[PDB]
Ligand binder design. Structure first.
Ligand SMILES: Nc1ncnc2c1ncn2[C@@H]1O[C@H](CSCC[C@H](N)C(=O)O)[C@@H](O)[C@H]1O
Ligand SMILES: [Zn+2]
Ligand SMILES: [Zn+2]
Ligand SMILES: [Zn+2]
Lengths: 55, 52, 81, 431, 104, 91
């Protein structure tokens, strides 16, 4: 369900490992359960630190 | 100021008195580094006097 | 094959650091990343090799690799686990 | 102030509202690689209900696309339509006017006070390829045009502002500019904008650094009036070995492109260190190793006078004074008198024998090497000296170095010789 | 007067932040396949030779190594940010490994 | 500063528990009450909980001291606590 929703925000009809990684890492309890697993071809969530940005 | 055209060509002053007019203009502006033989400084002085 | 640790080139490790959100890279860090990558690969390769040797085989398969990784708490999904 | 010339400047060319393309392939972002996953900022649309303005992606907002020099596109970004990061597309230029002053042509002035980092005006023109650029450049050189109108959008792609463009073509070069050009991405295209480097007030001229590649063209003298002016329009040298000292200063020492080549070719190529191109630090070894020949040209004398007025180095002044010692042409000396060489020599003395950055013996050698041509030059009136009053400096330095008696006796002879000369008239003024 | 004005260069960090977004949006492998395969063979050679390596095993090893390196660099970026710096140093790598327990 | 090193040497050479027994016992009972009521507790379970919590807190303080050392400081701060917890994987 979460993977299909995340695909729907990406305007795609094909579920890929990227959408699965997005669905797992964006949900707190699912991230807690699947903490120590690496999703093949899943990539990384976009995260840029606040003080890393210029002023 | 060093160009081909001349300020005094638009006046009634004869060309034989151009250095006289430039010495008047240079001495009026309280310049002291001026020398009579330096035509360039005379032209600069008269240009800054008439068109500051 | 002789000293191909330099095959992990500087733009590649720069890309790997860049995915982690790192903005600036020190000039001395590359040897350290090569060393830690060598250590990790050494451990996983060792475990996969003894898994294969127990199986009386001469070719390391993906199942041994996924088994070794999962035994180190680094479970991998997508390769027949 | 100067009269407005905005409409007159506009009539000189075909005004454009947007950049024109020679073909649809040129000017595309990412070398034409269409990023179908366009970078969408995560900003939420902030609509002020009173003014009906979408305040999202503002100047002090944290829009990632704005920081990365990418403009939001309506209908694709979460910021919504009419966000505050559509400056190029909405064409919200700063209010500017056109005027004329000094030796410059038309120039752009700020009609209002403009904040720091604010977008001023989008540089407009025709996007052209390299061959079309070469053809147009050859045509303009045949036409004798004395104005640059080309900017490099990117590698192999140029923008011409000669016949068609915008008001930005009238901006003049400044060696200490208040604005700068930057490259931005709008959609799948590349734009060149002009942003304010500092706070600019109304009426002030808007200028940017040209950083111009000559492509082998001759230098053009810079009349910007900035104190940090290098005197000519250019940029980085086309190769190393090209300059070690500034031209006027290098040609003052008798050095040329060949002599500046030879030193670097003899040492840098043979494992000895020569720093990059920077005239803030003088390399004394090059100046000592330079060859010296007498001056017989008045333009070279003017360059020598400029070098005296500019260079602070002890060694460059030593070698220039030595070259003057070799020089014995009376007409060049009369030109130096007209240039008031005595005025420059007073400061050259003062910096070395009144301020003490060197050793007393070496300063004594310098003073003996600089009194000789002062003794030798033709002089016919104290009015030459009166433009410098260098006699006062001579008295101060003979009094300071009173223990070195040859310098004192030479200055005695020099002031005795100068005391006998005639004087010339200054018109009295009313009181 | 046919010269060209130059577009100058980007500020340090702008192209860095751009490529940060580009690599965090896309998912392709960042390590070259053949040098990594040779490195894996070099490490495996030290125990017992004549060991053939299936393509799927090499791909799994590459994916695991990339995931490990990305996690380590995230931790090292946190370490650098904690020390009021924006540049990561090897000391942050060693400290991250120390606190993670990988290094004794 | 001297008594800081004296306390470090004394506690690093000692082996007895540093958390007081009765407040920890009441804390354990108070925490366990809201999961299930009328709960009884063996003494050895409370001692095991105390020993495990003390070992965990000692390890956390050691890693926090390392984090404080990294930032050219000698005083530990809460930001060191959440840095150590974040890197170690707790949330
Ligand atoms: N500081 C400066 N000193 C001298 N010439 C300058 C200058 N800045 C710009 N220019 C001249 O202006 C050209 C750029 S086009 C600027 C507008 C043009 N002068 C006009 O009024 O139509 C340069 O190539 C140069 O010839
Ligand atoms: Zn935005
Ligand atoms: Zn926007
Ligand atoms: Zn200038």
């Amino acid at each position: 369900e979460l993977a299909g929703n995340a695909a729907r925000d990406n305007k795609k009809t094909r579920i890929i490992p990227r959408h699965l990684q997005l669905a797992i890492r964006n949900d707190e309890e699912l991230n807690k359960l699947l903490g120590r697993v690496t999703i093949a071809q899943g990539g990384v969530l976009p995260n840029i630190q606040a003080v890393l940005l210029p002023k | 100021p060093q160009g081909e055209m001349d300020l005094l060509d638009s006046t009634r002053i004869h060309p034989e008195d151009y250095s006289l007019a430039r010495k008047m203009a240079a001495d009026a502006l309280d310049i002291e580094d001026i020398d009579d033989d330096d035509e360039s400084a005379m032209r600069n002085a008269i240009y800054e006097m008439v068109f500051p | 094959l002789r000293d191909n640790i330099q095959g992990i080139t500087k733009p590649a490790i720069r890309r790997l650091a860049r995915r982690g959100g790192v903005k600036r890279i020190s000039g001395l860090i590359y040897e350290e990343t090569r060393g830690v990558l060598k250590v990790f690969l050494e451990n996983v390769i060792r475990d996969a090799v003894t898994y294969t040797e127990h199986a009386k085989r001469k070719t390391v398969t993906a199942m041994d690799v996924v088994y070794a990784l999962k035994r180190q708490g680094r479970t991998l999904y997508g390769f027949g686990g | 102030y100067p009269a407005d010339k905005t409409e007159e400047a506009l009539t000189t060319f075909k005004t454009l509202s947007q950049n024109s393309y020679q073909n649809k392939t040129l000017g595309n972002a990412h070398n034409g690689r269409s990023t179908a996953d366009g970078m969408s900022c995560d900003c939420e649309e902030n609509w002020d209900t009173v003014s009906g303005i979408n305040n999202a992606c503002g100047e002090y907002s944290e829009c990632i696309n704005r920081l990365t020099s990418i403009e939001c596109i309506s209908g694709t970004c979460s910021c919504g339509d009419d966000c505050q990061n559509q400056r190029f597309q909405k064409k919200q230029y700063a209010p500017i006017a056109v005027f004329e002053t000094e030796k410059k042509g038309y120039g752009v002035r700020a009609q209002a006070d403009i904040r720091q980092d604010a977008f001023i005006y989008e540089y407009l023109g025709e996007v052209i390829d390299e061959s079309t650029f070469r053809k147009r450049k050859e045509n303009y050189d045949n036409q004798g045009l004395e104005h640059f109108y080309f900017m490099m959008l990117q590698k192999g792609e140029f923008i011409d502002a000669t016949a068609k463009g915008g008001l930005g073509r009238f901006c003049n070069h400044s060696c200490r500019p208040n604005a700068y050009v930057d490259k931005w991405e709008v959609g799948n295209k590349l734009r060149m904008g002009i942003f304010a480097k500092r706070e600019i007030y109304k009426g002030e001229e808007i200028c940017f650094d040209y950083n111009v590649d000559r492509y082998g063209a001759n230098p053009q003298k810079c009349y910007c009036g900035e104190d940090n002016c290098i005197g000519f329009l250019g940029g980085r040298t086309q190769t190393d070995s090209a300059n070690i000292l500034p031209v006027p200063i290098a040609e003052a020492l008798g050095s040329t492109n060949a002599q500046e080549q030879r030193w670097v070719r003899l040492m840098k190529e043979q494992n000895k260190s020569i720093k990059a191109s920077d005239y803030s630090s003088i390399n004394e070894d090059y100046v000592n190793s330079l060859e010296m020949r007498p001056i017989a040209d008045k333009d070279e004398a003017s360059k020598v006078t400029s070098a005296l007025l500019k260079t602070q180095d002890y060694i460059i002044l030593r070698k220039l004074i030595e070259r003057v010692s070799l020089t014995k042409d009376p007409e060049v000396l009369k030109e130096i008198v007209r240039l008031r060489g005595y005025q420059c020599v007073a400061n050259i003395l003062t910096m070395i024998v009144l301020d003490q950055e060197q050793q007393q013996v070496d300063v004594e050698s310098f003073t003996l090497s600089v009194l000789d041509m002062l003794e030798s030059w033709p002089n016919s009136s104290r009015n030459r000296i009166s433009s410098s009053q260098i006699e006062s400096v001579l008295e101060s330095v003979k009094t300071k170095l009173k223990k070195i008696q040859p310098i004192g006796k030479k200055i005695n002879s020099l002031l005795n010789s100068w005391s006998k000369l005639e004087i010339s008239y200054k018109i009295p003024k009313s009181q | 007067t046919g010269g060209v004005m130059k577009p100058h260069r980007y500020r340090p960090g702008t192209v860095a932040l751009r490529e940060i977004r580009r690599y965090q949006k896309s998912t392709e492998l960042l390590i070259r396949k053949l040098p990594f395969q040779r490195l894996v063979r070099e490490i495996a050679q030290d125990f017992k030779t004549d060991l053939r390596f299936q393509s799927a095993a090499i791909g799994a090893l590459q994916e695991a190594s990339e995931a490990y390196l990305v996690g380590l660099f995230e931790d090292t970026n946190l370490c650098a940010i904690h020390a009021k710096r924006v540049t990561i140093m090897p000391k942050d790598i060693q400290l991250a490994r120390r606190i993670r327990g990988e290094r004794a």
